């Protein structure tokens, strides 16, 4: 099954934005020369308007349908400065991405779609302000937002200063989405001395993937210009595999204590936060911080992992289990739990980092000799040794039989204290 993340056309191309009514080809520019218009002062941060040195801008889609406007050459975004100009206007300036409201813009299309003569406008503050050229149509000037909105059906003269069309473009760098695959059965040991399959050698199944706009990714290896041109979107893969918890020979008719370490450590969580502003909730759902929050829904939809419903962070889980071997022989037993793996890749395929969370809720056992020679292993005692939160303080009702190769779902078993009461 192939995959499509469904980005709009304008979110896949860096476009040159020209004014619809300008006669001499004026548009959004990165010209070094200052503003030629009296009441329109320019500076180092000012977004310029000129017929030379065009800007090539991408529009990253936010979950609420608004856009982040970024520049291909320097990787900075458009920003509505809180400072005031004449007539209660705000300058539009270049700034680094922060994810604040002042960096979000609403695109509104209007005009004659039937003759292909439509145009678009950018609005802010719940459509109370429209982006406009300062005073001129065909002269070098600045860009600002005004609260003086005019009708669009008879396109006032002032409305012309707000009308944009798409011109030339550069393709963004989009990585290819991998194809999904099925999860294998829990691996069987081949002999008494076979210690099983370790995580490094475990076969992965691809279940999801999302395209992360470079602005939310912290990749120290690249500068913001190389990052925006060659790695506009990073690839975040979601995979699953059987992560071994322990492998041991259990002597005939013996009870043995085994520690089971699952979940995720704080250091790994901190790492994901640092790089992506993302981390795992105690229900194994996804949680987000400020800088990536605006894209949560698109990301999760792509990953096929749900949004978390708790505020509790997943942590390290240490449990002590007692098992009983009822066979008359000594047996090689091995237990695996479901691993949820997240991988960040660059457009070229280079792996940036991996993060693994071990889901103790889905686990199974395999043995040598196998069934029907041997009888299944039995859980006779379950104790929680160390866990920093009480999201899941439940233990299994013992005794519980672990049938070879069968997956045991903690939520479908009888627990103490009882759930679903």
């Amino acid at each position: 099954t192939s995959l499509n993340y469904n980005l709009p056309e304008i979110s896949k191309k860096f476009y040159n934005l020209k004014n619809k009514y300008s006669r001499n080809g004026y548009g959004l520019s990165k010209t070094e020369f200052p503003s030629s218009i009296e009441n329109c002062p320019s500076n180092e941060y000012s977004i310029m308007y000129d017929n030379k040195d065009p800007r090539f801008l991408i529009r990253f889609l936010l979950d609420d349908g608004r856009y982040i406007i970024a520049d291909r050459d320097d990787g900075e975004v458009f920003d509505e400065a809180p400072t005031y100009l004449d007539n209660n206007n705000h300058p539009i300036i270049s700034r680094h991405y922060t994810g604040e409201e002042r960096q979000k813009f609403e695109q509104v299309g209007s005009g004659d779609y039937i003759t292909g003569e439509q145009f678009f406008q950018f609005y802010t503050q719940n459509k109370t302000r429209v982006l406009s050229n300062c005073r001129a149509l065909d002269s070098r000037t600045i860009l600002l937002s005004t609260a003086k909105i005019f009708p669009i059906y008879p396109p006032a003269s002032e409305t012309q200063l707000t009308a944009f069309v798409n011109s030339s473009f550069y393709a963004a760098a989009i990585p290819q989405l991998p194809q999904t695959s099925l999860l294998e059965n829990i691996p069987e040991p081949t002999s008494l001395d076979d210690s099983g399959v370790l995580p490094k050698d475990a076969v992965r199944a691809v279940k999801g993937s999302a395209l992360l706009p470079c602005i939310i990714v912290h990749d120290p290896n690249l500068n913001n210009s190389d990052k925006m041109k060659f790695n506009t979107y990073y690839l975040l893969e979601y995979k699953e595999y059987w992560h071994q918890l322990w492998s041991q020979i259990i002597p005939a008719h013996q009870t043995v204590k085994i520690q089971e370490r699952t979940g995720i450590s704080e250091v790994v969580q901190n790492s994901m936060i640092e790089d992506l502003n993302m981390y795992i909730g105690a229900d194994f759902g996804m949680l987000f911080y400020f800088r990536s929050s605006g894209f949560k829904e698109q990301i999760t939809r792509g990953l096929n992992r749900p949004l978390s419903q708790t505020t509790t962070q997943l942590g390290e889980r240490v449990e002590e289990m007692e098992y009983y071997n009822s066979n008359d022989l000594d047996v090689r037993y091995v237990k695996y739990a479901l691993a949820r793996e997240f991988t960040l890749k660059r457009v070229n395929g280079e792996i940036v980092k991996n993060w693994v969370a071990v889901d103790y809720r889905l686990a199974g056992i395999q043995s040598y000799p196998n069934a029907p020679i041997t009888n299944p292993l039995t859980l006779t005692k379950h104790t929680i040794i160390r866990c920093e939160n009480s999201y899941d303080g439940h233990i299994f009702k013992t005794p519980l039989i672990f049938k070879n190769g069968e997956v045991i779902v903690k939520t479908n078993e009888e627990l103490i204290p009882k759930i679903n009461q």
Binding site: T1, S2, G65, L362, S390, Y391, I419
Partner: protein
């Protein structure tokens, strides 16, 4: 696998099962009960197996849920001081947030004309007697707002069709071959839509029991517009339709609360606004960025055969179609929901090695 293939299914998402709820702290067996009348007060009543006590949580794009009962399909509606049952209209007071304090217990919160501000949770005023559900600002370390699921019954969802590759352009067999009226229809995508958001002759209460989920299917195909045998160096004028008819737009809007914009993006009404992101993602469509609706337009176009030999030419336009289906697969809409887009056209020709027709001038007919 086969079994493990359904490993994702073992731990289900909120809207894949029917539940029975009770407040964790109640000692006597009280369950959350909805009134038999379409409108009324939500109450804790002695637990029984009646459909008044069974609920489905329909999830939305941001994770909030719509809570409908199995008896009549009326939803949880926040009011002044109490929670009432009422018909779903897509009102802001009909969206709730489920917060899991633990793996087994959760509370229901509603939010004001505010954002981060007054999140209040649902709470009964008694454990000993039947009570209405009230609001409280006392959330932290308060177990009285804590809810548990007494029962959980897994829903069998309809089988959705497999996604197909973009439709290919039809081929002509000879000089006299006009070609097929349409190409093979291609499944681009399909999405699940709660029964409470659709228009149908079946009662809401019945839909809740037999078809709680409907699904919308999105297909693409090439539609024939014209066909002619062009003599060498001849210019002909052909008429090409575009957009959507007034009846089709009205039928679609009435049926699924979704309209098509002038930019060919989709416009979502009050009922479907909260699920627009999931809808467009599943169907591979886009949300509209204009307020103008798509209308029907008739275009004339000049086509010139530049080859020194006669050529057969058939013009096709890209057609996009939406169909509403019940859980049993039956199609609900009787009127076709089709949008033709004259910006994407393909010209099928005989002989195959012949060039593309030269496009001249385009006019718009004001019939």
């Amino acid at each position: 696998m086969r079994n493990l293939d359904f490993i994702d299914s073992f731990i289900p998402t909120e809207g894949k099962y029917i539940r029975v709820m009770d407040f964790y702290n109640s000692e006597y067996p009280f369950c959350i009960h909805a009134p038999s009348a379409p409108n009324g007060d939500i109450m804790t009543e002695i637990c029984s197996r009646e459909n008044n006590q069974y609920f489905i949580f329909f999830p939305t794009d941001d994770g909030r849920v719509i809570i409908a009962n199995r008896h009549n399909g009326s939803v949880f509606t926040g009011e002044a001081t109490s929670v009432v049952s009422d018909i779903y209209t897509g009102s802001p007071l009909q969206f709730f947030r489920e917060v899991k304090r633990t793996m087994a217990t959760y509370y229901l919160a509603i939010q004001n004309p505010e954002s981060a501000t007054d999140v209040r949770a649902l709470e009964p005023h008694s454990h000993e007697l039947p009570s209405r559900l009230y609001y409280t600002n006392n959330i932290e370390n308060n177990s009285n707002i804590l809810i548990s699921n007494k029962e959980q019954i897994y829903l069998t969802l309809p089988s959705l069709p497999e996604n197909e590759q973009y439709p290919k352009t039809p081929v002509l067999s000879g000089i006299d071959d006009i070609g097929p009226n349409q190409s093979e229809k291609s499944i681009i995508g399909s999405t699940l839509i709660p029964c409470i958001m659709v228009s149908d002759f079946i009662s809401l209460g019945e839909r809740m029991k037999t078809t709680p989920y409907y699904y919308v299917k999105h297909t693409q195909y090439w539609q024939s517009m014209w066909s002619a045998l062009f003599p060498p160096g001849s210019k002909e004028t052909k008429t090409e339709k575009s957009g959507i008819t007034d009846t089709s737009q009205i039928s679609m809007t009435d049926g699924i609360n979704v309209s098509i914009g002038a930019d060919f993006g989709l416009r979502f009404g009050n009922k479907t606004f909260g699920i627009k992101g999931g809808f467009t993602y599943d169907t591979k469509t886009q949300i509209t960025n204009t307020s103008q609706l798509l209308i029907e337009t008739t275009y004339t176009r000049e086509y010139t055969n530049t080859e020194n030999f006669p050529v057969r030419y058939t013009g096709y336009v890209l057609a996009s179609e939406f169909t509403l289906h019940r859980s049993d697969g039956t199609q609900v809409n009787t009127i076709p929901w089709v949008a033709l887009n004259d910006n994407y056209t393909t010209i099928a020709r005989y002989p195959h090695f012949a060039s593309e027709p030269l496009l001249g001038n385009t006019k718009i007919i004001t019939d």
